[PDB]
Design a protein around this ligand. Structure first.
Ligand code: DGD
Ligand code: CLA
Ligand code: CLA
Ligand code: CLA
Ligand code: CLA
Ligand code: CLA
Ligand code: CLA
Ligand code: LMG
Ligand code: DGA
Ligand code: BCR
Ligand code: BCR
Ligand code: CL
Ligand code: CL
Ligand code: NA
Lengths: 48, 449, 35, 31, 99, 145, 30, 37, 187, 48, 238, 44
């Protein structure tokens, strides 16, 4: 809410989030929930 | 003898001069067999002369008397020694037979016929004569099958052998109904060698041992007849290299594998190598220490089932990764150990709590205390204990001596297998002496490697 | 996990069979020597 | 430290690499 | 070249390289011993020591070796440096558990 | 902070054994006048016989910013003994430079290290150049005859 | 941050190895 | 111990195991005698 | 350069494993390999020896001072040993711990009194002799065995304590520790 | 099977141990030994 | 598996199968539960087998729930072979005490996100009051590590350096939580047990249990998480 | 139990075969390679 990605200088993270990658392997979701099954296509998965 | 001028071999490879001399090679072999039987008899007589009856033999640095005792000679319940005359007789018989074998080897090495082919065609051979090679292999397979059947006959009719798993602490037992089931016998040889499985080292009873020996003796006899009456197939002829050095390399690989396996038997197996004669194994001694401290602190009360270690995992008892109740501490790594002094205290879920509270036998207590005090740890100048221990105890386990020596022998014989397999391939191909300098293969290859 | 074990068993068996039948395929004849 | 070690590592990589690349490219153009 | 990927093609360069490697290694070790003469050691990684001090879960083999070195010094000093006259009671000697 | 004098319940004066130069870490040991260890900070706080709590060690400071002050609580006596292991006790501002709490080397130490390393490397250079001078005519190779 | 530096250095070393193997100056037999 | 009748032969018994080592050394003695031809 | 011949073929020296020590108004046998040590954990100690291997195996002789006519005036062996718990070593841990395992509550040390006995001597001396096994939560060396032999002589309380590791105890320091214990004569 | 154990090999006429360089090595080995796996041992002997 | 069949199996048959971590499952009898005769029985062969581990976690958005974990320490989480006393009343009320046995198991679960959560799954000293349908109570949760445990820098409770000695000028009052104090205070946990599948001819009972207990606090260095353990349990009366 | 395992460590399974499909795929792969080598046998 008060520290979203665009307040943190994230440039490619919005482009990942725009097309559906919203979970990370760190257990968090970009919308603030908990990701228990982030799958292969997390942020780190797309990076790898 | 020969020389480098006529043979191409220097003195340090002088035994290679015997490659194509059948009679002299036979003489070297028979003299060597006499040497082996000589060491057997002399070491046996040395061990019986230095044997002390009241002490356990594994405290006396003995490796052949434990073998003869495991065969069931001169020992009683708990492996107590009753007589040493069988061991003395074994040593004497080996020493005299070694004298006979030494005479034969010296004769055939010195004044026997140099080659056996012209005057004794039954014993004559060339290395590329595959039929005669399989004939000799078949004769030796028959002899080995007869030896395995000799072990079977001993165990079945001629006094039995020492069962460490006999109730009450082990005794010499007649094996009745050996395990002849093919599934049980051949499941050992395809079992994984890793922890909890152990391949063939994990054979844990005399029935399986004697049944497997029935199987190996019958298979050796049948294969011996097969190789007497057959010729190697064309696929074998294409696959193998047919020369004396190649056959030597095959045997070197086989005996290297056998030496590594014997190392593992001496280190892990307590059935074919009873702890009463060979001392405890490493796992046995560690589990014995855990059991001894458990029974001590439960004599002092202390509720060993609920006592908790500094890490929080359990001081005396814990769980295996599959759920069995096991001894706590680093001896968790030895949770798969099975021994006659601890198996009556285990039920289906592992160490039974009420059985461990109420059913601890005095013989189990004594054996565990002894095995804790005689762990297979020591220095090569025979100072018992860990490397930090002071010079007080003159003890090294026979299991440790056997495992160290036979790992070294297995490794060197693997190296010798590599040496002779490579040299046999290079000599069959024709470049064991070097590159021709006029038909160098690489100079005819396309560059850029 | 059983699918992974089946795949790994197939892969290991394939490579081991290649090794075995490669040395069965007249290997002592594949050398530049005379003989 | 986090950034002074960073510039030390970057310079130790780049300056000798620059020297080596100068000499190599000169040589390879020569031959 | 077909086994390891690279090979020598120059005999000269090979013999020199065989000269060069042990001499360079011994000279580097001599420089390190010169550093040790002044107790200018490569003893600790300060960032890892900070993380270990602020975090009781963080253990590495480097931290294990630091503990082992502490044990070596404490149990060696009294007999190894008699001039220091260290009569250390056993209760200050760092020990593990039971063992 | 001033000199730290340590005493036990019996009133005898104790001295912290100072850390020798070799030791990165050193156990805290308090020794009496006659060379007998009387207190310590034990590693094993069980069946111990010489801890600060058991012996009853107090510390009094003279001459510094703690002059006249006496501390009897073991939690502070332990830290002042651990500081007295390093010699005279000082207060340090660590926030200004973000000091990491680990000792550095002096300029004389850095000078000695650099110059000893240069001295060995220059011994090698002297060997190489004496070799080059004496063996100049064979520098590109031997005469082959 | 430092993990990036370590990984970059290791990967660059492996790249130098790759180039030294497959893009070596070929040994010429003349 | 040895049997009682064989007790005075223990000194002979205590030397016998080294004879294989003596054999591998005797091979080198013979080779030196033929000057390692 | 003072000419003294070496001992070649000179039979044996004393290999008894013990040396006789005569202190002030007591005599005892010390292990042959143990070195004297200047440590005094009790201020009324007149003797201390420690093993060359480890300082866990030690021995000391307290002289002290007493007002009772005889050690029999201490009631009983159990009442005599209940007053010397400071010989064990005070537990310096102050946090509550019920997670040590078989150690009651807040305790990391325990003393099992294996046996109490009364030994009377030739000169009329009567000794109290004590086997105690002290064990800790870490349990160093599997616990430490303490051997106490005490009596009252002149106007003082002579006491001998021998400490050994349990690992050392089944290694074979039990023989030398009992040899030290059974040789304590004060008179 | 381990290396040479010369701890307390040299003793005087009264049987007191004369320490050697082997004994100094043994002190260093004890220092390493009592510290490795500081929490993994519940029993004194290092049999496992 | 039933207890009789488990006893019929041998150690060689059970070894490596995982059954040794499993509670006995009674197959006969009824779920009448009130069929069980009221009295004063001695509980013995009490066994507890977890079926799920969940850890209380708070989202970034503020939602706090119990999230699913992945077990890390394998089949070592079983509690079995415990003894106690059970007083079953005529109206249907029960008093339940666990006296001693294997009533603790160190267990580590991985949280979604890669955080290790160690905890001592324990039921010791459980005093459960209630009815046959459900009885609830408290149990002691001992400290995960003993006081003789040593941290990676050799700092502990009963043992240790008491400070960071690799930093001779840093071990100060700003890290008192890590070095100057080490805490091993025991905690409490809650458990509710429900009884079903009672055999009244052999005096054995099955059922389900629901426990909530704190995690390890290192040695006082971090606040504890809450773990909810659901599972089955088995016992024999008298 | 809280999770599923193959539970095959130990127990002495032949070639570690806990499911007969493993023995079948071993035999099939070896037989396929053997059949390829056997039909391509009088060849070098
Ligand atoms: C090879 C991989 C490692 C195999 C291994 O873990 O080896 C160990 C196994 C034995 O395994 C053990 O087998 C044991 C069997 O004992 C069991 O059964 C016994 C029966 O009395 C006892 O009851 C005992 O208490 C009980 O535990 C246990 O199962 C152990 O858990 C298990 O680890 O050895 C074997 O299977 C023998 C197989 C040959 C071993 C060769 C070792 C050297 C290998 C290569 C050398 C290369 C050289 C060239 C280099 C260049
Ligand atoms: C299987 C291949 C694949 C897939 C599916 C992904 C997937 C992803 N990439 Mg991509 N990527 C790929 C390969 C791939 N990439 C390769 C090959 C490259 C190197 C060129 C990159 C370089 C890369 C970068 C540089 C970035 C990503 C990013 C992304 C993420 C968001 C995509 C996005 O916003 O693009 C949106 C794409 C567009 C808006 C392009 C639209 C296409 C234009 C309009 C075509 C116009 C000309 C066309 C011919 C006209 C057609 C005429 C018509 C009549 C048919 C997503 C996870 C982004 C990210 O956040 O990750 C870090 C980002 O920054 N990728
Ligand atoms: C069954 C065993 C066996 C047999 C029958 C032979 C047979 C042959 N080998 Mg040998 N070899 C083997 C095992 C075997 N080897 C092994 C185990 C290795 C060592 C890894 C080798 C390595 C090898 C080499 C390197 C060479 C031979 C060669 C030869 C030929 C001449 C041998 C000779 O004159 O030696 C004469 C005997 C000596 C010179 C004495 C050697 C001294 C040894 C090393 C003393 C070691 C004693 C030591 C105390 C043992 C303890 C060590 C360890 C067990 C702990 C002969 C055909 C030669 C060849 O290829 O000829 C065609 C050749 O050069 N072999
Ligand atoms: C296991 C040990 C062994 C065996 C059994 C042999 C066997 C053989 N060696 Mg030898 N050799 C060995 C190891 C061995 N060697 C080693 C370690 C080396 C390295 C030094 C060599 C190097 C070597 C070379 C260089 C040559 C051989 C050759 C020979 C053969 C002819 C011997 C001869 O004419 O000697 C003549 C020696 C003597 C007349 C001296 C007397 C030796 C006798 C046999 C001693 C027996 C003592 C014994 C106690 C008698 C008891 C009899 C009875 C009461 C039991 C013979 C078959 C030769 C060969 O290939 O022949 C064609 C040859 O040129 N060997
Ligand atoms: C390969 C099998 C092997 C193994 C497992 C052993 C094992 C044993 N032997 Mg033995 N021995 C063997 C072969 C073997 N020996 C051989 C080939 C010889 C003939 C020379 C002997 C002759 C021999 C005697 C005469 C004695 C032993 C003794 C011993 C014991 C102590 C060994 C020792 O202190 O060595 C010390 C370590 C080394 C020598 C390592 C040297 C490194 C290599 C060899 C080079 C030990 C049980 C002693 C014993 O207790 O007998 C009752 C004894 O006095 N053995
Ligand atoms: C000392 C033992 C010995 C020796 C060295 C020989 C030697 C030989 N045998 Mg054999 N054999 C023997 C014992 C022996 N055998 C016995 C005991 C039997 C009765 C069972 C036979 C029956 C037999 C048959 C039926 C045949 C031979 C043949 C052969 C030849 C080639 C075999 C081959 O390619 O091997 C290398 C083997 C292979 C490339 C594949 C074989 C498959 C393996 C070895 C079978 C076991 C698999 C199993 C998983 C192993 C478990 C243990 C392992 C995990 C450690 C060779 C001359 C062949 C020949 O030419 O006969 C005329 C042939 O067809 N053997
Ligand atoms: C004889 C040479 C010498 C000596 C003894 C000193 C000594 C000193 N200088 Mg100094 N200085 C020197 C020459 C020297 N300097 C020169 C030539 C320069 C110009 C580049 C500097 C620039 C300089 C700066 C700008 C600063 C110092 C500072 C320091 C002080 C802090 C300790 C130190 O040196 O840092 C620690 C020294 C080391 C860690 C030495 C490194 C060990 C060797 C070189 C590594 C081996 C090479 C290796 C392969 C490199 C690969 C690394 C790569 C991966 C990054 C110390 C009193 C500092 C200070 O306190 O300022 C007031 C400071 O900030 N000096
Ligand atoms: C010396 C070897 C002693 C053991 C011999 C039998 C080995 C065995 O059966 O392994 C059988 C093991 C068993 O495999 C394991 O068994 C375990 C216990 O049953 C579990 O079931 C595991 O799930 C299973 O993977 O398989 C292996 O681990 C690897 C075998 C493949 C080895 C390939 C070697 C390739 C190199 C050369 C091949 C030359 C030909
Ligand atoms: C874990 C389960 C698998 C365990 C397998 C172990 C049991 C079977 C293997 C033992 C074979 C004995 C080896 C003798 C020949 C060795 C060299 C050779 O090959 O010599 C070769 C030799 C040269 O002519 O050939 C010949 O004489 C004939 C020799 C080969 C005869 C066996 C052929 C395999 C039979 C089944 C194959 C089905 C094949 C097709 C499968 C396709 C599925 C889609
Ligand atoms: C070829 C050759 C060789 C080799 C050789 C050989 C190897 C030989 C041998 C041999 C042998 C192998 C021998 C053996 C022997 C034996 C004997 C001779 C014996 C005997 C007897 C007796 C007399 C005994 C007695 C007794 C008894 C009975 C018991 C008691 C005790 C006694 C001991 C007394 C060489 C290398 C040198 C060189 C080259 C040539
Ligand atoms: C007595 C006994 C027993 C039994 C055992 C048995 C029965 C065994 C066996 C076994 C067997 C039955 C074995 C076999 C084997 C085999 C082998 C070992 C092999 C091989 C191979 C090779 C070596 C080859 C190679 C090659 C190839 C790959 C191809 C071509 C080329 C060549 C030839 C090179 C038991 C344990 C029960 C118990 C105890 C004791
Ligand atoms: Cl470690
Ligand atoms: Cl342990
Ligand atoms: Na430890």
């Amino acid at each position: 809410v008060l520290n979203p990605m665009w307040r943190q200088g994230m440039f490619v993270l919005p482009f990942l989030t725009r097309l559906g990658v919203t979970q990370s392997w760190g257990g968090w979701t970009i919308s603030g929930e908990t990701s228990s099954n982030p799958g292969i296509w997390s942020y780190e998965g797309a990076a790898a | 003898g020969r020389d480098q001028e006529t043979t191409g071999f220097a003195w340090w490879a002088g035994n290679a001069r015997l490659i194509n001399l059948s009679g002299k090679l036979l003489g070297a072999h028979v003299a060597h067999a006499g040497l082996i039987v000589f060491w057997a008899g002399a070491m046996n007589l040395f061990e019986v002369s230095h044997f002390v009856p009241e002490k356990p033999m594994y405290e006396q640095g003995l490796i052949l008397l434990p073998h003869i005792a495991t065969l069931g000679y001169g020992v009683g319940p708990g492996g107590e020694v009753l007589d040493t005359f069988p061991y003395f007789v074994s040593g004497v018989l080996h020493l005299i037979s070694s004298a006979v074998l030494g005479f034969g080897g010296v004769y055939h090495s010195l004044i026997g016929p140099e080659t056996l082919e012209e005057s004794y065609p039954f014993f004559g051979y060339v290395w590329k004569d595959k039929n005669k090679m399989t004939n000799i292999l078949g004769y030796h397979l028959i002899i080995l099958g007869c030896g395995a059947w000799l072990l079977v006959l001993k165990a079945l009719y001629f006094g039995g052998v020492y069962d460490t798993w006999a109730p009450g602490g082990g005794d010499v037992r007649i094996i009745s109904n050996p395990t002849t089931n093919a599934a049980i016998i051949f499941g050992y040889i395809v079992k994984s060698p890793f922890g909890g499985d152990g391949w063939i080292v994990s054979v844990d009873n005399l029935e399986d041992i004697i049944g497997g020996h029935i199987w190996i003796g019958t298979l050796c006899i049948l294969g011996g007849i097969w190789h007497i009456y057959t010729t190697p197939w064309p696929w074998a002829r294409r696959a193998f290299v047919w020369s004396g050095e190649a056959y030597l390399s095959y045997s070197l690989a086989a005996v290297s594998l056998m030496g590594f396996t014997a190392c593992c038997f001496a280190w892990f197996n307590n059935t074919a190598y009873p702890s009463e004669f060979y001392g405890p194994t490493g796992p046995e001694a560690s589990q014995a220490q855990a059991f001894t401290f458990l029974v001590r602190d439960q004599r002092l009360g202390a509720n060993v089932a609920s006592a908790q270690g500094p890490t929080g995992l359990g001081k005396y008892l814990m769980r295996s990764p599959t759920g069995e109740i096991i001894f706590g501490g680093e001896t968790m790594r030895f949770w798969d150990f099975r021994g006659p002094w601890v198996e009556p205290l285990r039920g289906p879920s592992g160490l039974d709590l009420v059985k461990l509270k109420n059913d601890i036998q005095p013989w189990q207590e004594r054996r565990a205390a002894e095995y804790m005090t005689h762990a297979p740890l020591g220095s090569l100048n025979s100072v018992g204990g860990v490397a930090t221990e002071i010079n007080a105890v003159n003890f090294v386990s026979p299991r440790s001596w056997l495992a160290t020596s036979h790992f070294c022998l297995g490794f060197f014989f693997f190296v010798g297998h590599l040496w002779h397999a490579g040299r046999a391939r290079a000599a069959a191909a024709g470049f064991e002496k070097g590159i021709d300098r006029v038909d160098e293969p690489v100079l005819s290859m396309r560059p850029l490697d | 996990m059983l699918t992974l074990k089946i795949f790994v068993y197939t892969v290991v068996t394939f490579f081991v069979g290649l090794f075995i039948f490669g040395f069965l395929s007249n290997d002592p004849s594949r050398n530049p020597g005379k003989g | 430290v986090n950034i002074l070690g960073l510039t030390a590592t970057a310079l130790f990589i780049i300056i000798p690499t620059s020297f080596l690349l100068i000499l190599y490219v000169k040589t390879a153009a020569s031959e | 070249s077909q086994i390891f990927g690279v090979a020598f093609s120059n005999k000269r360069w090979l013999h020199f390289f065989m000269l060069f490697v042990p001499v360079t290694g011994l000279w580097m070790s001599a420089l390190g011993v010169v550093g040790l003469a002044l107790n200018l050691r490569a003893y600790d990684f300060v960032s890892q020591e900070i993380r270990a001090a602020e975090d009781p879960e963080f253990e590495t083999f480097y931290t294990k070796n630091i503990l082992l070195n502490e044990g070596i010094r404490a149990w060696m000093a009294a007999q190894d440096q008699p001039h220091e006259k260290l009569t250390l009671p056993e209760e200050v000697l760092p020990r593990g558990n039971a063992l | 902070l001033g000199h730290a004098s340590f005493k036990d319940q019996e009133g005898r004066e104790l001295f912290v054994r100072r850390m020798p130069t070799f030791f990165e870490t050193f156990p805290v040991v308090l020794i009496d006048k006659d060379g007998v260890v009387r207190a310590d900070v034990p590693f094993r706080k069980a069946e111990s016989k010489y801890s600060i709590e058991q012996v009853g060690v107090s510390v009094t400071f003279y001459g510094g910013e703690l002059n006249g002050l006496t501390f009897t609580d073991p939690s502070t006596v332990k830290k002042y003994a651990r500081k007295a292991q390093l010699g005279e006790i000082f207060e340090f501002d660590r926030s200004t430079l973000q000091s990491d709490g680990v000792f550095r080397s002096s300029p004389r130490g850095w000078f000695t290290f650099g110059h000893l390393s240069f001295a060995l490397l220059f011994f090698f250079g002297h060997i190489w150049h004496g070799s080059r001078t004496i063996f100049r005519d064979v520098f590109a190779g031997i005469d082959e005859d | 941050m430092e993990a990036l530096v370590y990984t970059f250095l290791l990967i660059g070393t492996l790249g130098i190895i790759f180039f030294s193997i497959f893009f070596r100056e070929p040994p010429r037999i003349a | 111990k040895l049997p009682e009748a064989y007790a005075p032969f223990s000194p002979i018994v205590d030397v016998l195991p080294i004879i294989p080592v003596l054999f591998i050394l005797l091979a080198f003695v013979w080779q030196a005698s033929v000057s390692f031809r | 350069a003072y000419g003294e011949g070496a001992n070649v073929f000179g039979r044996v020296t004393n290999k008894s494993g013990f040396v006789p020590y005569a202190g002030d108004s007591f005599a005892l046998l010390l292990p042959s390999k143990w070195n004297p040590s200047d440590e005094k954990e009790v201020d009324s100690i007149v003797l201390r020896y420690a093993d060359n291997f480890d300082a866990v195996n030690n021995v000391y002789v307290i002289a002290q001072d007493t007002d009772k006519s005889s050690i029999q005036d201490y009631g009983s062996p159990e009442e005599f040993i209940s007053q010397f718990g400071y010989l064990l070593g005070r537990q310096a841990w102050a946090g509550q711990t019920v997670s040590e395992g078989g150690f009651d509550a807040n305790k990391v040390s325990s003393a099992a009194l294996l046996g109490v006995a009364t030994e009377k001597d030739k000169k009329g001396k009567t000794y109290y002799k004590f086997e105690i096994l002290s064990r800790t939560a870490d349990g160093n060396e599997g616990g430490r065995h303490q051997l106490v032999k005490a009596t009252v002589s002149n106007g003082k309380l002579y006491l001998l304590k021998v400490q050994a590791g349990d690992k050392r105890w089944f290694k074979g320091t039990d023989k030398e520790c009992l040899g030290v214990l059974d040789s304590f004569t004060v008179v | 099977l381990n290396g040479f154990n010369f701890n307390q090999s040299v003793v005087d006429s009264n049987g007191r141990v004369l320490n050697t360089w082997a004994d100094i090595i043994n002190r260093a080995n004890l220092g390493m030994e009592v510290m490795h796996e500081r929490n993994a041992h519940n029993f004194p002997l290092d049999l496992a | 598996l039933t207890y009789d069949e488990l006893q019929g199996l041998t150690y060689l048959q059970v070894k490596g199968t995982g059954i040794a971590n499993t509670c006995p499952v009674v197959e006969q009898g009824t779920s009448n539960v009130r069929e069980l005769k009221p009295g004063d029985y001695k509980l013995e062969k009490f066994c507890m087998e977890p079926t799920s581990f969940t850890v209380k976690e708070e989202d970034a958005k503020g939602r706090e729930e119990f999230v699913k974990t992945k077990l890390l320490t394998r089949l070592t989480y079983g509690l079995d072979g415990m003894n106690g006393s059970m007083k079953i009343n005529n109206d249907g009320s029960v008093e339940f005490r666990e006296d001693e046995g294997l009533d603790y198991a160190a267990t580590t679960v991985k949280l979604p996100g890669g955080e290790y959560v160690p905890f001592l799954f324990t039921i010791k000293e459980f005093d459960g009051k209630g009815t046959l349908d459900s009885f609830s109570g408290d149990f002691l949760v001992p400290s995960y590590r003993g006081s003789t445990f040593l941290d990676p820098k050799g700092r502990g409770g009963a043992t240790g350096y008491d400070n960071a000695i690799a930093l001779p000028a840093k071990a100060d009052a700003d890290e008192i939580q890590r070095l100057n104090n080490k805490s091993y205070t025991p905690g409490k946990g809650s458990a509710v047990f429900s009884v079903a599948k009672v055999d009244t001819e052999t005096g054995e009972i099955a059922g389900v249990f629901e426990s909530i207990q704190p995690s390890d606090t290192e040695m006082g260095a971090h606040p504890a998480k809450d773990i909810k353990i659901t599972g089955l349990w088995y016992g024999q009366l008298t | 139990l809280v999770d599923d395992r193959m539970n095959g460590d130990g127990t002495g399974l032949p070639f570690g075969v806990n499911d007969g499909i493993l023995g079948w795929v071993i035999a099939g792969t070896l037989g396929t390679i053997w059949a390829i080598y056997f039909v391509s046998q009088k060849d070098l």
